[PDB]
Design an enzyme around this catalytic site. Structure first.
Site, PDB file in Angstrom:
ATOM      1  N   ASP A 144      25.988 -13.055 -27.430  1.00 15.78           N
ATOM      2  CA  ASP A 144      26.093 -11.674 -27.864  1.00 15.78           C
ATOM      3  C   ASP A 144      25.073 -10.808 -27.144  1.00 15.78           C
ATOM      4  OD1 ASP A 144      27.083  -9.433 -29.199  1.00 15.78           O
ATOM      5  OD2 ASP A 144      25.460  -9.593 -30.689  1.00 15.78           O
ATOM      6  N   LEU A 193      15.243  -0.335 -41.250  1.00 14.84           N
ATOM      7  CA  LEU A 193      15.528   0.274 -39.949  1.00 14.84           C
ATOM      8  C   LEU A 193      16.991   0.686 -39.782  1.00 14.84           C
ATOM      9  CD1 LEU A 193      13.364  -2.235 -38.095  1.00 14.84           C
ATOM     10  CD2 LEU A 193      13.319   0.149 -37.423  1.00 14.84           C
ATOM     11  N   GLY A 194      17.874  -0.082 -40.385  1.00 14.76           N
ATOM     12  CA  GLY A 194      19.312   0.110 -40.304  1.00 14.76           C
ATOM     13  C   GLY A 194      20.018  -1.190 -40.623  1.00 14.76           C
ATOM     14  N   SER A 195      21.277  -1.106 -41.044  1.00 16.76           N
ATOM     15  CA  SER A 195      22.022  -2.307 -41.407  1.00 16.76           C
ATOM     16  C   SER A 195      22.798  -2.881 -40.226  1.00 16.76           C
ATOM     17  CB  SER A 195      22.943  -2.035 -42.591  1.00 16.76           C
ATOM     18  OG  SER A 195      23.533  -3.235 -43.059  1.00 16.76           O
ATOM     19  N   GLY A 196      22.933  -4.198 -40.227  1.00 17.97           N
ATOM     20  CA  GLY A 196      23.684  -4.928 -39.214  1.00 17.97           C
ATOM     21  C   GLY A 196      25.068  -5.312 -39.703  1.00 17.97           C
ATOM     22  N   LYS A 227      14.662  -9.536 -40.118  1.00 19.45           N
ATOM     23  CA  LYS A 227      16.119  -9.544 -40.118  1.00 19.45           C
ATOM     24  C   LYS A 227      16.645 -10.395 -41.254  1.00 19.45           C
ATOM     25  CE  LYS A 227      20.308  -8.856 -38.145  1.00 19.45           C
ATOM     26  NZ  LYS A 227      20.488  -9.075 -36.671  1.00 19.45           N
ATOM     27  N   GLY A 277      24.286  -8.636 -41.869  1.00 22.17           N
ATOM     28  CA  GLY A 277      22.949  -8.593 -42.464  1.00 22.17           C
ATOM     29  C   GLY A 277      22.325  -7.211 -42.470  1.00 22.17           C
TER      30      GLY A 277
HETATM   31  C1  LIG Z   1      18.864   0.169 -31.625  1.00 17.13           C
HETATM   32  C2  LIG Z   1      19.315  -0.388 -32.955  1.00 17.13           C
HETATM   33  C3  LIG Z   1      20.026  -1.711 -32.815  1.00 17.13           C
HETATM   34  O1  LIG Z   1      21.233  -1.770 -32.635  1.00 17.13           O
HETATM   35  N1  LIG Z   1      19.258  -2.814 -32.904  1.00 17.13           N
HETATM   36  C4  LIG Z   1      19.760  -4.168 -33.095  1.00 17.13           C
HETATM   37  C5  LIG Z   1      18.568  -4.918 -33.562  1.00 17.13           C
HETATM   38  N2  LIG Z   1      18.251  -6.145 -34.103  1.00 17.13           N
HETATM   39  C6  LIG Z   1      16.940  -6.140 -34.283  1.00 17.13           C
HETATM   40  C7  LIG Z   1      16.202  -7.281 -34.851  1.00 17.13           C
HETATM   41  C8  LIG Z   1      15.518  -7.159 -36.055  1.00 17.13           C
HETATM   42  C9  LIG Z   1      14.828  -8.239 -36.582  1.00 17.13           C
HETATM   43  C10 LIG Z   1      14.815  -9.451 -35.913  1.00 17.13           C
HETATM   44  C11 LIG Z   1      15.496  -9.587 -34.707  1.00 17.13           C
HETATM   45  C12 LIG Z   1      15.487 -10.840 -34.005  1.00 17.13           C
HETATM   46  C13 LIG Z   1      15.514 -11.855 -33.372  1.00 17.13           C
HETATM   47  C14 LIG Z   1      15.537 -13.050 -32.599  1.00 17.13           C
HETATM   48  N3  LIG Z   1      16.453 -13.954 -32.952  1.00 17.13           N
HETATM   49  C15 LIG Z   1      16.446 -15.064 -32.202  1.00 17.13           C
HETATM   50  C16 LIG Z   1      15.576 -15.268 -31.155  1.00 17.13           C
HETATM   51  C17 LIG Z   1      14.683 -14.250 -30.904  1.00 17.13           C
HETATM   52  N4  LIG Z   1      14.638 -13.115 -31.616  1.00 17.13           N
HETATM   53  C18 LIG Z   1      16.189  -8.500 -34.177  1.00 17.13           C
HETATM   54  N5  LIG Z   1      16.394  -4.940 -33.872  1.00 17.13           N
HETATM   55  C19 LIG Z   1      15.012  -4.541 -33.900  1.00 17.13           C
HETATM   56  C20 LIG Z   1      14.636  -3.340 -34.474  1.00 17.13           C
HETATM   57  C21 LIG Z   1      13.298  -2.999 -34.478  1.00 17.13           C
HETATM   58  N6  LIG Z   1      12.336  -3.767 -33.954  1.00 17.13           N
HETATM   59  C22 LIG Z   1      12.720  -4.924 -33.403  1.00 17.13           C
HETATM   60  C23 LIG Z   1      14.032  -5.349 -33.353  1.00 17.13           C
HETATM   61  C24 LIG Z   1      17.443  -4.156 -33.409  1.00 17.13           C
HETATM   62  C25 LIG Z   1      17.804  -2.827 -32.823  1.00 17.13           C
END
Ligand SMILES: *CCC(=O)N1Cc2nc(-c3cccc(C#Cc4ncccn4)c3)n(-c3ccncc3)c2C1
EC number: 2.7.10.1
Length: 273
Positions: free
Chosen positions: A138, A16-19, A43, A22
């Protein structure tokens, strides 16, 4: 309460994209006593990022799953976890991404009811974590995902605690003496609201992260957005107070913003309503 995930139960198909610490992937989930292949969001967190062992990370991730019960419609439940060499986190695949992208891409087409509704929703989810005593650490327009255009949900909560920096979003106590309280999350909420009201502009554009600390001490804040009436911008400015207890509470934010949603054109001046 927390599903422990085998490496064969899931496979990160696309990215989806890099963090910052991570990479975020789009994947599939073939569970234990289930034969379906559910689409999920994975993630992968970089190695040696968390200053804890996998067993310490596991027990801390058990409370970020306790939040999931009784739950909240504006809080992202964690489906499972993969504690191997790296920390992998599974959640539902939200195809409409973060609200940061939604406001940047939709800038003209977005209404006033939308922003005020989003501000009530973000405060509704944050108040739930306050009541369930989890401190986000955050919160920003990036960690708030659009389920549907009228349903935003907060993600990445407790992740900062899990590991061990968004300077331009932290409250001054968090920047100066690493103090993270429920009131420090209200500063981030104000910054988050300023992002929606500025169609995704980058806070303190120009100013380096190192500088911010002194800028907040000189009493300089994020400007008043060109849609924000002094009424609304005062809520935002109150969140950015130096004394944390003086900043509004998430119960009070839900209340003030709920009142504003009743007549959005009085509190937000956008061309189209
Ligand atoms: C719009 C793009 C952006 O900046 N995003 C940031 C982001 N993070 C996540 C994501 C991916 C996988 C897992 C998580 C989580 C969690 C969590 N941790 C602790 C408690 C509860 N939940 C977050 N996404 C994302 C992208 C696509 N679908 C879902 C999440 C983005 C978008």
């Amino acid at each position: 309460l927390l599903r422990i995930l085998k490496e064969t139960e899931f496979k990160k198909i696309k990215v989806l994209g890099s963090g910052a610490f991570g990479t975020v992937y789009k994947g599939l989930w073939i569970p234990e006593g289930e034969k379906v292949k559910i689409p999920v969001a994975i993630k992968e967190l970089r190695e040696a990022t968390s200053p804890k062992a996998n067993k310490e990370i596991l027990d801390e991730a058990y409370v970020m799953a306790s939040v999931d019960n009784p739950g909240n419609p504006h809080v992202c439940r964690l489906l499972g976890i993969c504690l191997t060499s790296t920390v992998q986190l599974i959640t539902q695949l939200m195809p409409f991404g973060c609200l940061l992208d939604y406001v940047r891409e939709h800038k003209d087409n977005i209404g006033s009811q939308y922003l005020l509704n989003w501000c009530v929703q973000i405060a509704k989810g944050m108040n739930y974590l306050e009541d369930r005593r989890l401190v986000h650490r955050d919160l920003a327009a990036r960690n708030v995902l659009v389920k549907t255009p009228q349903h935003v949900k907060i993600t990445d909560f407790g992740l900062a605690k899990l590991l061990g920096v968004p300077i331009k979003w932290m409250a001054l106590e968090s920047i100066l003496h690493r103090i993270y309280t429920h009131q420090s999350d209200v500063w981030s909420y104000g910054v988050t609201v300023w992002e929606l009201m500025t169609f995704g502009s980058k806070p303190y554009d120009g100013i380096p992260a190192s500088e911010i600390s002194s800028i907040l001490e000189k009493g300089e804040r994020l400007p008043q957005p060109p849609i924000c009436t002094i009424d609304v911008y005062m809520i935002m400015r109150k969140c950015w107070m130096i004394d944390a207890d003086s900043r509004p509470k998430f119960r009070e934010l839900i209340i003030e913003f709920s009142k504003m949603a009743r007549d959005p054109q009085r509190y937000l001046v956008i061309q189209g309503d």
